[PDB]
A paper describes a structure:
Intriguingly, the autophagy adapter p62/[name]/[name] was recently reported to recognize N-degrons, the N-end rule substrates of the well-characterized UPS, and where ultimately these substrates are delivered to ALS8,9. p62 is a key selective autophagy adapter that plays a role in the degradation of various cellular constituents such as misfolded proteins and their aggregates, malfunctioning organelles, and invading pathogens. Intriguingly, it was recently reported that the central ZZ-domain in p62 plays a critical role in the recognition of N-terminal arginylated [name]/[name] by the Arg-tRNA transferase ATE1. Here, we present the high resolution structures of the ZZ-domain of p62 in complex with 8 different N-degrons including type-1 and type-2, and subsequently identify key determinants involved in the unusual recognition.
However, a recent report has shown that the ZZ-domain of p62 also recognizes type-2 N-degrons, although with weaker affinity than with type-1 N-degrons. Therefore, we determined the structure of the ZZ-domain in complex with a variety of N-degrons comprising three type-1 N-degrons and five type-2 N-degrons. As described for the R-[name] complex, two aspartic acid residues, Asp129 and Asp149, bind to the α-amino group, and Asp147 forms a hydrogen bond with the first peptide bond, which means that these interactions are conserved in all different N-terminal residues. However, the side chain of the N-terminal residue of the N-degron is recognized differently. The side chain of Asn132 which undergoes a conformational change plays a critical role in interacting with the first residue of the N-degron. The bipolar nature of the side chain atoms (O and N) of Asn132 allow for the recognition of positively charged type-1 substrates as well as type-2 substrates, and especially N-terminal tyrosine and tryptophan residues since they possess polar atoms in the side chain. As expected, arginine at the primary position showed the strongest binding affinity with, intriguingly, tyrosine and tryptophan residues following in second and third place, respectively. Our structural and biochemical measurement data showed that the presence of tyrosine or tryptophan at the primary position resulted in relatively high affinity because these side chains contain polar atoms, oxygen in tyrosine and nitrogen in tryptophan that can form hydrogen bonds with the side chain of Asn132 of the ZZ-domain. Our structural information clearly explains the affinity measurement data as well as previous pull-down assay results showing that type-1 N-degrons and only a subset of type-2 N-degron peptides (Phe, Trp, and Tyr) displayed binding affinity with p62.
Author numbering: -3 to 45
């Protein structure tokens, strides 16, 4: 029962719904809100659920 949860690197809450993971940074993720706020805007991101 090893589980991987995804925490937003902005609000530090878990990412539920759309996940914006950085394509450059290893293991960097933002939630839909923090993405909307323009965080980490210098790196390309992958927007999957
Ligand atoms: Zn967030
Ligand atoms: Zn980045």
């Amino acid at each position: 029962w090893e589980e991987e949860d995804v925490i937003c690197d902005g609000c530090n809450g878990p990412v539920v719904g759309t996940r914006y993971k950085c394509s450059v940074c290893p293991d960097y993720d933002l939630c839909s809100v923090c993405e909307g706020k323009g965080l980490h805007r210098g790196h390309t991101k992958l927007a999957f659920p």
